[PDB]
Amino acid sequence: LPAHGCRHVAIIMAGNGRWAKKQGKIRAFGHKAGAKSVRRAVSFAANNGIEALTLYAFSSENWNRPAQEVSALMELFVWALDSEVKSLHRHNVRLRIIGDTSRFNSRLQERIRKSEALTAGNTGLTLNIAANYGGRWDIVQGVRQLAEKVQQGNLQPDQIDEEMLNQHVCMHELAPVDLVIRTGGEHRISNFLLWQIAYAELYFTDVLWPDFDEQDFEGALNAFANRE
Amino acid sequence: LPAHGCRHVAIIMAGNGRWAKKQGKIRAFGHKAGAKSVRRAVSFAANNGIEALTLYAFSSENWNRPAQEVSALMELFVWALDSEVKSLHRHNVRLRIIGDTSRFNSRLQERIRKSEALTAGNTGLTLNIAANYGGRWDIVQGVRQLAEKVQQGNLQPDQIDEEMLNQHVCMHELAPVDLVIRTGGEHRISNFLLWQIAYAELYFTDVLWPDFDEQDFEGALNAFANRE
Numbered sequence A, B: 001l002p003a004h005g006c007r008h009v010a011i012i013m014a015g016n017g018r019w020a021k022k023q024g025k026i027r028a029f030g031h032k033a034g035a036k037s038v039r040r041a042v043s044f045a046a047n048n049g050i051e052a053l054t055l056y057a058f059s060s061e062n063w064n065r066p067a068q069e070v071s072a073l074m075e076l077f078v079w080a081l082d083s084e085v086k087s088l089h090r091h092n093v094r095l096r097i098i099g100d101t102s103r104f105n106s107r108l109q110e111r112i113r114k115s116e117a118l119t120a121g122n123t124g125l126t127l128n129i130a131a132n133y134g135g136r137w138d139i140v141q142g143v144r145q146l147a148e149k150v151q152q153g154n155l156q157p158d159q160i161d162e163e164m165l166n167q168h169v170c171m172h173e174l175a176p177v178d179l180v181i182r183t184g185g186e187h188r189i190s191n192f193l194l195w196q197i198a199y200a201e202l203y204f205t206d207v208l209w210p211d212f213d214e215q216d217f218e219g220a221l222n223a224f225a226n227r228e
């Protein structure tokens, strides 16, 4: 049963640049080392009864990072979709990418579509990777779905309430986010899951994403259990 | 100039029940003592160049608190609109109430409307009191404004983007929220300004709202200045 009653954990995976800079290295080196922490967090979540794990992997504002940092990132995503997918599948993990995927390269989009298809029937941990994601953008997509319904004459503007918009934001089919963890030291949620984090516990740690391990994750969970 | 470059501070005024319970008293006693901290925070903000101060005074979920706690609260609001309004006016503070005011009693609504009218032309601190407010509700009101436009044939569903919804959420005429402070010990934003806090620094303190003073406020500001 969910470690300390926590059903859905979302993580802002920050501090990779800081971690690499402390060792005289570039951001891209830290992002690669960040992929190992992703593996450890996914394994920990799947082994501790967590229902969904949602990871902030690429904000819609990160397009403005250096071109080479961005390309290295895209190649890291492709690489992960090639290397870990069989394993997610064997572990009964259902993979979903949330965010505006229409802006990624062809090969990246085809791989996302196939990996999600392959694991769509899995019933264990749902792993959501937020890529080219923004919380405001997420809300706007639901708003457009409803505006279209207003267009078609199938919905009256006065019928729109919170629950109806809630059924049109990302991850509405999953348990609500209970805990948001941000590594790296900064205390902002940076446009991550705005609608969905309305009642979530927020946990900030100076631990840098590439160093985040099982004891750190257990620690964030215990802060949650003592969410008294 | 804004204390340490902070233009807009929003506060979740919590810990009043805990503060009163520690002394063997009921929540209502803590909420009354909370009114003194409101005075101190408003004075501090107006004297330190802050452009807007937004205070969470009554969540839309607080209707479920004990009837007598709720009534005492309504009477505390009326009382404040009667006692502090002249002073806000003399201090060049512009008062705004955000939230669903249609659900308050007649006398409370008339007083809100007159106090806002009286200070509408003031040019110093804008003080927003979030009463019967919810962040999701706030977003839905903007969504209805746009859905109506879609109805009237004056807007196409594909023209709706973040900036357009941003012009229809509360406080869109003010500087964006830079710092959210929550007193009381809990680490949740509890449906407060979801859309607006996308890039805000979040500061949690175990200090209880009735004890929050100028040194505590200066402290939250310095954490912000070191928002590095």
Ligand SMILES: CC(C)=CCC/C(C)=C/CC/C(C)=C/CSP(=O)(O)OP(=O)(O)O
Residues within 6 Å of the ligand: A013, A014, A015, A016, A017, A018, A019, A027, A030, A031, A032, A034, A035, A038, A056, A057, A058, A059, A062, A076, A077, A080, A129, A184, A209
């Ligand atoms: C999903 C997968 C297979 C791997 C995940 C790889 C990682 C860790 C991705 C996050 C990349 C970015 C752009 C993080 C932003 S903060 P930053 O760390 O770039 O810089 P900061 O140190 O916080 O200032």
Ligand SMILES: CC(C)=CCC/C(C)=C/CC/C(C)=C/CSP(=O)(O)OP(=O)(O)O
Residues within 6 Å of the ligand: B013, B014, B015, B016, B017, B018, B019, B027, B030, B031, B032, B034, B035, B038, B056, B057, B058, B059, B062, B076, B077, B080, B129, B184, B209
């Ligand atoms: C605007 C004005 C004139 C005065 C403000 C008066 C105050 C402090 C209002 C907030 C009241 C409520 C319902 C706070 C909720 S948490 P809680 O403190 O009720 O309980 P908690 O201790 O956090 O568990």
